[PDB]
Amino acid sequence: SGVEGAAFQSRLPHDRMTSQEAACFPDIISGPQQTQKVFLFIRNRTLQLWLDNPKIQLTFEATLQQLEAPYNSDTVLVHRVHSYLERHGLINFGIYKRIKPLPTKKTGKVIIIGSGVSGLAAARQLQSFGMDVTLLEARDRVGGRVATFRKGNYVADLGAMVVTGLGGNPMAVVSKQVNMELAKIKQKCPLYEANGQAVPKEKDEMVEQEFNRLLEATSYLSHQLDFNVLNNKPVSLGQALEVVIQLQEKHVKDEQIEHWKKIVKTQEELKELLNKMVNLKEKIKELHQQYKEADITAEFLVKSKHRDLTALCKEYDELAETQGKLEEKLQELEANPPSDVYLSSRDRQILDWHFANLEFANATPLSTLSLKHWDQDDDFEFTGSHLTVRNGYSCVPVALAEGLDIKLNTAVRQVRYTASGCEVIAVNTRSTSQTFIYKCDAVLCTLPLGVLKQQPPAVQFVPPLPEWKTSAVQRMGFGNLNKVVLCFDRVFWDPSVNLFGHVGSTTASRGELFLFWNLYKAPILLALVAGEAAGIMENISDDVIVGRCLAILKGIFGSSAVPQPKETVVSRWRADPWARGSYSYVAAGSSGNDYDLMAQPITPGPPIPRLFFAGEHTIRNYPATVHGALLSGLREAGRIADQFLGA
Numbered sequence: 001s002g003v004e005g006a007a008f009q010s011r012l013p014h015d016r017m018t019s020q021e022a023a024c025f026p027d028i029i030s031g032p033q034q035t036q037k038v039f040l041f042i043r044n045r046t047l048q049l050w051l052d053n054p055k056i057q058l059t060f061e062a063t064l065q066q067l068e069a070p071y072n073s074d075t076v077l078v079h080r081v082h083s084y085l086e087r088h089g090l091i092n093f094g095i096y097k098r099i100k101p102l103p104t105k106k107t108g109k110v111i112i113i114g115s116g117v118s119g120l121a122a123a124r125q126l127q128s129f130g131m132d133v134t135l136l137e138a139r140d141r142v143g144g145r146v147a148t149f150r151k152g153n154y155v156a157d158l159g160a161m162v163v164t165g166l167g168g169n170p171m172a173v174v175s176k177q178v179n180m181e182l183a184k185i186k187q188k189c190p191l192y193e194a195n196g197q198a199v200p201k202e203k204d205e206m207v208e209q210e211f212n213r214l215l216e217a218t219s220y221l222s223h224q225l226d227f228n229v230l231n232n233k234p235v236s237l238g239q240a241l242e243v244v245i246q247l248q249e250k251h252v253k254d255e256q257i258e259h260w261k262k263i264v265k266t267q268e269e270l271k272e273l274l275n276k277m278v279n280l281k282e283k284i285k286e287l288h289q290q291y292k293e294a295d296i297t298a299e300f301l302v303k304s305k306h307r308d309l310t311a312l313c314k315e316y317d318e319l320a321e322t323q324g325k326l327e328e329k330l331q332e333l334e335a336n337p338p339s340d341v342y343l344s345s346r347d348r349q350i351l352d353w354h355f356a357n358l359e360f361a362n363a364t365p366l367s368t369l370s371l372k373h374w375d376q377d378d379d380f381e382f383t384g385s386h387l388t389v390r391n392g393y394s395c396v397p398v399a400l401a402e403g404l405d406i407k408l409n410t411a412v413r414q415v416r417y418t419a420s421g422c423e424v425i426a427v428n429t430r431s432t433s434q435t436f437i438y439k440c441d442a443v444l445c446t447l448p449l450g451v452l453k454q455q456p457p458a459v460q461f462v463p464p465l466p467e468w469k470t471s472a473v474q475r476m477g478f479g480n481l482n483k484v485v486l487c488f489d490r491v492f493w494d495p496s497v498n499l500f501g502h503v504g505s506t507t508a509s510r511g512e513l514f515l516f517w518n519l520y521k522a523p524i525l526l527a528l529v530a531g532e533a534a535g536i537m538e539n540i541s542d543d544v545i546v547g548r549c550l551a552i553l554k555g556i557f558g559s560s561a562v563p564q565p566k567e568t569v570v571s572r573w574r575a576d577p578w579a580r581g582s583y584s585y586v587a588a589g590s591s592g593n594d595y596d597l598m599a600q601p602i603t604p605g606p607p608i609p610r611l612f613f614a615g616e617h618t619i620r621n622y623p624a625t626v627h628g629a630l631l632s633g634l635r636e637a638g639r640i641a642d643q644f645l646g647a
């Protein structure tokens with residue numbers, strides 16, 4: 001429906017109040033049923049007015065205008081709902097035309113660390129809420145792990161590039177605001193063995209089906225058999241995968257054993273039978289010989305001896321009947337063996353492709369993932385096809401940055417927080433002699449988890465962060481994933497296909513250049529380096545890793561079809577000191593709860609919160625994404641405004 005759809009698009013149930021709404025509106029839940037229905041309608045229709053036209057600010061007055069009777073009559077409740085939705089960033093978020101220009105005297109001074117999507121989203125909110133906001137960004141650009149290469153007509157995303165579903169996705173709103181050109185990803189992804197041969201359809205299908213089968217087995221082990229802690233250690237997804245493969249190998253070998261036993265037994269029966277038919281030919285040879293040796297006792301003798309001779313033949317002809325029905329049963333058995341192996345050597349390599357794809361999706365080798373929790377975010381997937389940003393995802397943070405006080409080339413080195421306020425200390429990345437000191441009432445830290453894990457610390461906290469936060473930083477996974485960009489002057493691949501896969505020769509290197517993306521207007525390919533290969537490959541110079549791309553592609557389309565690229569780019573996110581990786585993942589021995597702990601603000605001991613945290617690693621239901629980064633900034637802006645302007 002329509003107002004129904006607005007709730008859905010806001011990740012809210014259209015027909016009941018959430019717990020957050022129940023806290024901010026206790027008189028509503030405690031009150032008559034009909035009025036709680038009134039609340040839900042005001043909320044849904046207010047979301048719908050906004051989502052219908054997310055390019056201009058939706059004011060209280062304008063909401064009151066467009067409410068039909070009797071709703072437009074309950075002026076106070078409308079204001080309460082509008083204010084709540086605005087405060088929590090469910091309306092008037094992203095970038096939109098302000099109706100009321102910004103309050104001229106600010107209230108409260110917030111420093112935001114980092115100018116990625118989480119920091120920008122929070123920043124625009126705090127500025128709308130009337131606060132003095134400055135961002136400190138260490139790079140010479142905004143966007144952080146949204147990073148787009150642009151030169152000539154070439155566009156290519158080195159960080160995030162995929163928009164997941166649009167249903168429920170806040171990026172659907174930002175896309176409308178920023179005029180993002182999205183494009184649904186076509187599902188077809190042909191695979192080429194390491195020699196360049198296409199994987200036949202039967203094998204692509206067969207192997208993929210066994211991949212889905214194996215993964216659900218690990219989920220059955222985890223969530224039905226509690227196979228989660230083994231010998232004091234938490235089970236990794238990769239470890240579970242080796243277990244369920246080992247059992248399929250055992251089953252294959254068992255039916256092979258039973259089959260050899262059927263054969264031997266039937267062979268022994270034939271062996272025994274043929275010997276026994278032999279002794280009956282000897283018994284007939286010995287009676288046949290007495291038949292030519294042949295009076296009324298000799299007259300009756302022939303009848304008796306013919307009766308005798310032809311009865312042993314009826315024994316023998318009958319046995320050659322059983323002789324047939326055996327060597328038939330035998331002949332069929334040598335014809336229909338069960339499988340000799342669970343996975344042929346090529347089958348295994350193809351299967352390792354699908355594992356690599358999963359190491360791509362999680363930015364880490366499977367042996368590092370929590371078996372129990374690595375997909376704990378799946379209940380929150382958006383609906384609709386996934387899309388790529390044909391014009392470069394940077395358009396989002398660049399649009400978000402408009403009008404913000406953003407200080408680039410300004411690297412934070414120490415964050416001091418006390419009951420009386422905060423001081424952020426930064427150096428200029430261009431003249432590290434130059435030092436700045438930023439007094440403020442609160443600090444929002446969107447530093448990536450990779451930077452927080454850095455030992456010795458890139459950024460120092462005074463006082464040090466509490467143990468409960470630092471141990472969560474240490475538990476959580478921070479993965480890695482890299483891209484090679486190949487720009488050509490001509491398209492030599494299939495333009496109808498967005499994706500094709502390269503199947504590697506070994507398990508350990510299964511993620512090296514395993515997936516190619518065809519996303520853009522100019523002749524560009526992205527190749528992913530995933531899993532174990534991600535971090536190791538950063539140690540290869542661009543020229544050589546590109547040479548290896550060109551070799552794979554020349555294997556697939558021929559050596560004459562692949563010209564030398566005109567421009568190349570290679571990401572190295574792990575060695576990037578402003579990132580130290582690509583995104584978080586749920587490590588074995590962590591859980592979604594560490595994402596809540598990460599979001600927890602800090603209060604210096606007796607008191608009011610001072611140090612706040614946003615970023616993809618702080619949002620339990622949408623981690624490792626752009627939209628989760630965005631939602632996390634919006635959340636912290638609400639939390640900070642509640643504290644410094646009133647709830």
Ligand SMILES: [C]C1=C([C])[C]=C2C(=[C]1)N([C][C]([O])[C]([O])[C]([O])[C]OP([O])(=O)OP([O])(=O)O[C][C]1O[C](N3[C]=NC4=C3N=[C]N=C4[N])[C]([O])[C]1[O])C1=NC(=O)[N]C(=O)C1=N2C(=O)[C][C]C1=C(F)[C]=C(Br)C(F)=[C]1
Binds near residue numbers: 118412459573
């Ligand atoms: C890297 C990457 C790649 C390569 C790819 C991708 C990605 C990544 N992803 C993820 C995203 O991107 C993320 O999450 C976001 O971006 C977030 O963000 P934040 O949180 O905001 O962070 P950043 O950006 O980084 O920011 C921060 C800042 O800070 C700064 N600094 C540092 N240090 C310092 C500073 N400042 C001052 N001082 C100092 N000291 C920096 O520089 C920055 O700026 C993604 N996502 C999405 O959504 N999509 C996509 O596509 C992506 N990608 C891939 O490809 C895949 C992934 C994924 C997907 F797709 C899906 C899903 Br469900 C998942 F999970 C994932």
